[PDB]
Design a protein around this nucleic acid. Structure first.
Lengths: 281, 156, 167
RNA sequence: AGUUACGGCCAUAUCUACUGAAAAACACCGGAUCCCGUCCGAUCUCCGAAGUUAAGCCAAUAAGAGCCAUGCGAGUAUUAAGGUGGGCGACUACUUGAGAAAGCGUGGUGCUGUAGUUU
RNA sequence: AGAACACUCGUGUAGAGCAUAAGGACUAAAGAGUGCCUGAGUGUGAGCACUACUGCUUGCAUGAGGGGAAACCCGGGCCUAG
């Protein structure tokens, strides 16, 4: 019925572009970014965490009039520099990426030597050291992803905290929480260092060795075993904190402009129509 | 007879324009305000807190005080044949920065150069005033290419 | 042949309608046996005196099955209908439906206090990629290449079960 | 030069048919042991790479519908000031000024900011 | 099983709803469901409607306050009467 009459089209109002594309929630964005008129010089940084089929992305972003500015970035695909061979979208790889992201920031601001790392041994928020500069402050932006206990977005967030950035959070969201009992932190540590997957690998070899090969082929190719994971992850964390990856080079891929298609001229378009009439008669 | 509620007679006012319904854009929230700026009121019907009374719609005033999400603006009004100042509270969603000072500020930037040189070299500024458009200018014309005009159109 | 681009079952829908009291409990126990699920009771949209229905009163129960279990039930039912269907039973959308009058033909033992009920079967066919229209982020309408058409649904039925589609 | 993450102005960006696409991505895709959620691992959450460019996203095409601009309509319709102008009225001519819309013709069919990646 | 019973697939700028006049407002909601709470807190200022009464907007301080991962919001009823 609706689309049968011209007036439908003439009266229609389009949503904003990133809404048509289902990428942004405007009601959430406005609450997150809106300016406080009395706190002049406050310049809130969002920590943006997004998870793709391939990789984990952390970005630190400041919202300015005209467009958001990226302060710093880190990606799970870069951990290949420190010898990560497998599971680039794993719970551990989320945590590692948040850790990396934090360090890069505190180095630029030169806070790095004041606020030291701390590998997952409590659930308190980061606290300003007396007689020194204040901690760098951020708030979490989870986008369109759901909040639930043990979601991978919160792993990256704990990574950043352990790395030295101040984020307010409640422990309600982590594995090892209990409704009316103290926090069981060994369960949390367990997941960070990969116990959850070791326990699955061990099970399948008893159940079905065919299915095992199908499920874990990539691991087999690296000769990794369930026993090796803790050493792997301890090394990975230390190396992130210790080393720094080489700078990126700039290159003109300008010549790939050969591949871009170009629209027809008016002169062509007209002749084409003319020919179409003559082909029909 | 008519009534006297707070939103009397606002059927035309306080309605959205064609194909412009919905909440405000980000630019509204990221604009910073300061005391002494001139600001201009235009109510957004979708926001129900911090609305001013409809007399003030489309009027321009001066910022007196700045709070978390609202502003206090000074206005003048005639009541009982006397002038009265009024202090109006408005939320930041219903205001836009006024353009009314634009030309004057440009002129001040030019004056600010001259007024310094006027101490060094002259004694008093030339001050660069505006002047209204004068008489029609003189013209020298080549006088080829004449066009004749006539009441040829009979207009039945 | 080109992988992807091959038909599958995505859903089988089963429903029993029995307006009244303990009948719905008696019914629900049947669905709970035919499939390893607990079915969802559904309520009357309007109030209709003649049919004996108040509004917001429960009137029917249904269950939706997917995966391997769907294949067993469909084979079990098309036998009861003797592999015979009419050109009326297929849609413009690539789906088809039929009915059964007697639940005991699906094999379960009688138990004279439980009773005899009929059942509706409805089947929905698909090709990969349909997720593009159901996921939260970047939701979009599918291409005409990846729909299932009326002819294809008939061809699949004939091929898979050797049934006869009457004009 | 494209893409991708986060954006700005919110159809020159919409809607309907068709067609293309080096690389790296983006996806569809393969499972449910756990955390989490369903009448239903469809959606949501977690653990994965055997396949595939068919789809989406991106780009082209159409005397396409719709949107945006401009010319014309047109000094036309309406209107401020004025006179011992006219008319039984209804209303209307003139003098000094301000000045449209619909239709219809012609052209367009997103532009840009910060970072990452790919000859 | 009928004009009108339950279940599905595709389209769907609101053609629906929003207790109670009329107008305005609202679309990953302010509508329909589901979870938790009693902020329908406590002191004390400044203002808007021709402003006394009344109604609403907004400042600072506090609670062994609430909801939410958090940014945020809440001292009655989406706004204009009771």
């Amino acid at each position: 019925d609706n689309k049968s009459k011209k007036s439908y089209f003439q009266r229609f109002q389009t949503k904003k572009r990133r809404r048509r594309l289902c990428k942004t929630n405007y009601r959430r964005r406005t609450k997150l970014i809106k300016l406080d008129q009395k706190n002049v010089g406050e310049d809130k940084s969002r920590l943006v965490v997004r998870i793709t089929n391939s990789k984990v992305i952390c970005q630190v972003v400041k919202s300015h009039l005209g467009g958001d500015m990226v302060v710093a970035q880190a990606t799970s695909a870069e951990l290949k520099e420190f010898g990560l061979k497998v599971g680039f979208t794993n719970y551990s790889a989320a945590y590692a990426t948040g850790l990396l992201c934090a360090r890069k920031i505190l180095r630029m601001e030169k806070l790095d030597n004041i606020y030291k790392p701390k590998f997952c041994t409590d659930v308190d928020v980061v606290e300003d050291i007396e007689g020194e500069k204040n901690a760098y402050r951020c708030y979490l932006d989870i986008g369109l992803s759901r909040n639930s206990k043990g979601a991978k977005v919160f792993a990256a967030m704990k990574g950043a905290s352990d790395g030295g950035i101040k984020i307010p959070y409640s422990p309600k969201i982590f594995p090892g929480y209990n409704k009316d009992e103290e926090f069981d932190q060994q369960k949390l540590r367990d997941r960070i260092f990969g116990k959850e997957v070791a326990n699955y690998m061990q099970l399948l070899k008893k159940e079905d060795e065919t299915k095992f090969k199908k499920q874990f082929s990539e691991y087999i190719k690296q000769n990794i075993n369930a026993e090796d994971l803790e050493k792997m992850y301890e090394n990975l964390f230390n190396s992130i904190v210790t080393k720094e990856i080489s700078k990126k080079e700039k290159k003109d891929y300008s010549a790939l402009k050969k591949y871009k298609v170009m629209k027809l001229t008016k002169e062509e378009r007209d002749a084409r129509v003319q020919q179409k009439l003559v082909e029909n008669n | 007879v008519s009534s006297h509620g707070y939103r009397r007679q606002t059927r035309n006012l306080f309605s959205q324009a064609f194909r412009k319904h919905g909440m405000p854009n980000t630019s509204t929230y990221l604009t910073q305000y300061a005391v002494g700026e001139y600001v201009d009121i235009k109510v957004n019907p979708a926001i129900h807190k911090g609305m001013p009374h409809k007399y003030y719609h489309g009027r321009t005033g001066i910022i007196k005080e700045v709070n978390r999400g609202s502003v206090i603006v000074l206005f003048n009004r005639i009541l009982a044949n006397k002038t009265v100042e009024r202090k109006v509270i408005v939320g930041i969603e219903h205001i836009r920065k006024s353009k009314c000072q634009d030309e004057y500020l440009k002129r001040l930037e030019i004056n600010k150069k001259i007024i310094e040189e006027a101490e060094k070299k002259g004694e008093v500024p030339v001050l660069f005033k505006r002047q209204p458009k004068g008489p029609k200018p003189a013209v020298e014309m080549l006088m080829n290419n004449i066009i004749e005009l006539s009441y040829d159109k009979v207009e039945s | 042949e080109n992988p992807m681009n091959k038909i599958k079952i995505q859903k089988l829908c089963l429903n029993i309608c029995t307006g009244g009291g303990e009948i719905l409990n008696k019914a629900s126990k049947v669905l709970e046996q035919l499939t390893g699920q607990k079915p969802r009771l559904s309520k009357s949209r309007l109030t209709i005196r003649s049919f004996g229905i108040r509004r917001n009163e429960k009137i029917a129960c249904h269950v939706t099955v997917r995966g391997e279990k769907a294949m067993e039930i469909l084979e079990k039912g098309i036998k009861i209908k003797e592999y015979e269907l009419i050109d009326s039973n297929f849609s413009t959308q690539g789906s088809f439906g039929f009915g059964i009058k007697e639940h005991i033909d699906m094999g379960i033992k009688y138990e004279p206090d439980v009773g005899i009920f009929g059942m509706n079967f409805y089947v929905v066919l698909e090709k990969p990629g349909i997720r593009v229209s159901k996921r939260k982020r970047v939701k979009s309408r599918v291409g005409n290449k990846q729909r299932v058409t009326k002819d294809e649904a008939k061809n699949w039925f004939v091929k898979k079960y050797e049934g006869i589609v009457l004009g």
